């Protein structure tokens, strides 16, 4: 997939600003969450307990966000920007800004009540793509790369899908050998996608279905994009 240029361009215009936006939603959402971290059972009771009004806030700001600035896989790639030179000079000075605009897309992807958090899918892979650097942040995100897993095959009206299109559709690659060409270094020496094709499979095949609870899902997720953000991902 292309980032379309001009779009990306205008991001680089209104990063700072949306920015602020964003990191605004995300602590009212984190102290919302703070208040109610066992009534909170599902996603559709953090839809509730937010209220109809923040939530239709919080989807229209992340439209513009995607329409405007050209988001089709619905965040930020360090991944695709590190890797193509015309993005990396766009944005190689921005990488703090870009870190918050994707904790929102990560945090409010909590509220999709299929189960399928296509967005906080995209985080995690784009983290493990991007990490060549010495990290036990790794481990973190192979971790919660489990879990949805497990959230996804958990949830039996979400269809069967194999493991390539379980990866692909979330990210702005084509084939699974593309990765190869985009990734860090433990992508290919940890022979990572191996490891998730086989996580994929085998908990599609198992009657356990050991999902965590919610509010211990959120709260690793958002323990995750906070790490995530005091990272430095341009190279
Ligand atoms: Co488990
Ligand atoms: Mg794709």
Same mark, same amino acid.
């Given at each position: 997939?292309?980032?379309?240029?001009?779009?990306?361009?205008?991001?680089?215009?209104?990063?700072?600003?949306?920015?602020n936006?964003?990191?605004?939603?995300?602590?009212?959402?984190?102290?919302?969450?703070?208040?109610?971290?066992?009534?909170?059972?599902?996603?559709?009771?953090?839809?509730?307990?937010?209220?109809?009004?923040?939530?239709?806030?919080?989807?229209?700001?992340?439209?513009?966000?995607?329409?405007?600035?050209?988001?089709?896989?619905?965040?930020?790639?360090?991944?695709?920007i590190?890797?193509y *030179? +015309?993005?990396?000079?766009?944005?190689?000075?921005?990488? @703090?800004?870009? $870190?918050?605009?994707? =904790?929102?897309?990560?945090? /409010?992807?909590?509220?999709?009540?299929?189960?399928?958090?296509?967005?906080?899918?995209?985080?995690?892979?784009?983290?493990?793509?991007?990490?060549?650097?010495?990290?036990?942040?790794?481990?973190?995100?192979?971790?919660?790369?489990?879990?949805?897993?497990?959230?996804?095959?958990?949830?039996?009206?979400?269809?069967?899908?194999?493991?390539?299109?379980?990866?692909?559709?979330?990210?702005?690659?084509?084939?699974? *050998? +593309?990765?190869?060409?985009?990734?860090?270094?433990?992508? @290919?020496?940890? $022979?990572?996608?191996? =490891?998730?094709?086989?996580? /994929?499979?085998?908990?599609?095949?198992?009657?356990?279905?050991?999902?965590?609870?919610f509010?211990?899902?959120?709260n690793?997720?958002?323990?995750?994009?906070?790490?995530?953000?005091?990272?430095?991902?341009?190279?």
């Amino acid at each position: 997939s292309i980032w379309d240029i001009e779009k990306a361009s205008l991001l680089v215009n209104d990063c700072q600003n949306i920015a602020n936006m964003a990191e605004q939603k995300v602590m009212m959402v984190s102290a919302i969450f703070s208040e109610s971290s066992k009534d909170i059972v599902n996603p559709e009771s953090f839809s509730e307990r937010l209220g109809k009004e923040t939530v239709k806030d919080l989807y229209e700001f992340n439209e513009q966000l995607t329409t405007k600035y050209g988001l089709e896989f619905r965040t930020i790639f360090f991944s695709y920007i590190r890797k193509y *030179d +015309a993005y990396w000079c766009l944005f190689e000075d921005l990488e @703090k800004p870009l $870190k918050s605009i994707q =904790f929102f897309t990560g945090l /409010i992807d909590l509220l999709d009540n299929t189960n399928k958090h296509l967005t906080l899918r995209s985080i995690v892979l784009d983290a493990l793509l991007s990490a060549d650097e010495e990290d036990s942040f790794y481990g973190d995100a192979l971790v919660l790369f489990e879990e949805l897993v497990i959230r996804y095959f958990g949830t039996d009206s979400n269809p069967s899908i194999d493991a390539s299109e379980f990866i692909l559709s979330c990210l702005p690659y084509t084939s699974l *050998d +593309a990765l190869n060409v985009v990734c860090g270094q433990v992508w @290919k020496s940890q $022979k990572i996608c191996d =490891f998730l094709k086989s996580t /994929i499979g085998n908990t599609s095949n198992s009657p356990l279905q050991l999902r965590a609870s919610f509010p211990a899902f959120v709260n690793a997720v958002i323990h995750f994009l906070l790490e995530f953000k005091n990272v430095r991902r341009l190279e």
